[PDB]
């Protein structure tokens, strides 16, 4: 990487004292290594900054992914809840209905049981009369 | 801005053919301008990529915020869902038993009615027979 | 760094004593160095406060991340809690019905027992009587 | 505010033409305004980022405070579940004992019922014998 040989032809370099050549070549080299250094860093920086952005783009899209899914999840629960409350209200009303029928049935069966007892009492008395009449007939002939 | 004057002393410089001095001052200036351009371009890129990075950070933090908002809503719905499903299970069981009792009550009432009919037919038959037996007490032989 | 040449014309300047030009250009330099000093110290401060802010931003997001995890844990505990309470309520009512049933079966068992004791008394009386009747018939030998 | 009087002595100043003093003082004042302007612009920036930082610190302190509460809420919820599970185990056991008691009582009532029927069979045989003995005794007496 001798820079003076890019800048000057041999014939020109010959007219330069060696110390002067060295002063120049050292300065040229210093500037050139700064140039190489800058280009090296700049390129590394670009690549790094892009990779950092690429990675947070992925983090974003994943976050957005979770939010869409979570939004759907909520909506499906709400829809599900609406239907459950309609089921509950229906069941509730149906059981109120059955409660009412049950109380009516209890009332009815109790009344029937009384009537049955009265009839059976009547039947007992009729039988008593019946056996009495039979007995009196056998006491004739 | 001839930097060559700082690299070489005035005597050394004056003993250079002017064509050589010019070639050196030109090349030196070229390198310095490239250096200034590299720094300029990098500082431009640096600033722009930073701006873009901070923008997507803002977006990501907003997505996380919305997700908190939605997640909170879902979690309350799930609890609400659990509670209603347990009410639902209970009502269903209460309904099952009530309808079982209803069937038994219906069966019981149909047998009560069947029994009542038989009792009333028996009663009417006893009354007819006793009316007849009474008449027969007064017969002659 | 002789700035003085800008503010004063050629004759005005050359008519200034050496000590005056030296004093003026030194003062101008000192004020320029305060200026450059201010500029460099600001840029230093600027970077430092950005770095400081950048750090707290990450601390904030780390705090929100910790909170998401914590809240998820609390909500799943609350879900188990609801489930657990409803199991308890069921059992509590189930047991209470069993306790009522127990009280009824105990009342039945005591009644059955008095029934049994009544039967045993009747049997003892029957046996005493049949012994007496037997004796009275044997006395007719 | 006369800057020129600070840098130069009265003897040097007297020997300056007035127009020249005015040019110098005007230039010095300009440079001084630049100095003061930078000190003002820094101080402006400084206070602005200072306040911005206080605001992000509030958000951090708030997030942390919320985390503390949630963290504490979770520990207490874990203890509620352990406590309720303890009660649940106790209820389950009581339930198991109740059902076993119910089973014991069914068994007892089945034994009693078998005993009852055997008592009633003995009674009927005793009654048949009694009726036989009475009729024979009624015939002879």
Secondary-structure map:
Four copies of one chain form a homotetramer.
Chain A lengths: L3 H4 L2 H5 L3 H121 L3
Total number of β-strand segments of chain A? 0
Largest interface: A-B, 75 and 73 residues
* Percent in helix of chain A: over 70%
CA radius of gyration of chain A is 57 Å
Oligomer class: homotetramer
Distance between the termini of chain A: 163 Å
Note the total helix count of chain A: 3
Beta strand % of chain A: under 5%
Q: Give the domain tally of chain A.
A: 1
- The secondary-structure element order of chain A is HHH
Q: How does the helix and strand content of chain A classify structurally?
A: mainly alpha
Largest sheet of chain A: none
What coarse outline of chain A follows from CA principal-axis ratios?
rod-shaped
Write out key terms for the chains shown.
homotetramer, 141 residues, mainly alpha, 3 helices, 92% helix, cell cycle, TPR oligomerization domain, Receptor tyrosine kinase
Question: Can you give a write-up of this model?
Answer:
- 4 copies of one chain form a homotetramer.
- Chain A is mostly helical and 141 residues long.
- Chain A has one domain.
- Chain A has 3 helices and no strands.
- The first copy, chain A, has helices at 4-7, 10-14, 18-138.
- The radius of gyration of chain A is 57 Å and the shape is rod-shaped.
- Chains A, B, C, D: It comes from Homo sapiens.
- Chains A, B, C, D: Belongs to the TPR family.
- Chains A, B, C, D: The modification N-acetylalanine is found at residue 1.
């Amino acid at each position: 990487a001798a820079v003076l040989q890019q800048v000057l032809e041999r014939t020109e370099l010959n007219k330069l004292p060696k110390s002067v050549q060295n002063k120049l070549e050292k300065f040229l080299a210093d500037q050139q290594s700064e140039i190489d250094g800058l280009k090296g860093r700049h390129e590394k920086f670009k690549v790094e900054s892009e990779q950092q952005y690429f990675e947070i783009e992925k983090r974003l899209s994943h976050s957005q992914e979770r939010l869409v899914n979570e939004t759907r999840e909520c909506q499906s629960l709400r829809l599900e809840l609406e239907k459950l409350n309609n089921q509950l209200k229906a069941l509730t009303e149906k059981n109120k209905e059955l409660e009412i029928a049950q109380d009516r049935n209890i009332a009815i069966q109790s009344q029937m049981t009384r009537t049955k007892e009265e009839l059976e009492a009547e039947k007992r008395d009729l039988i008593r009369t019946n056996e009495r009449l039979s007995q009196e007939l056998e006491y004739l002939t």
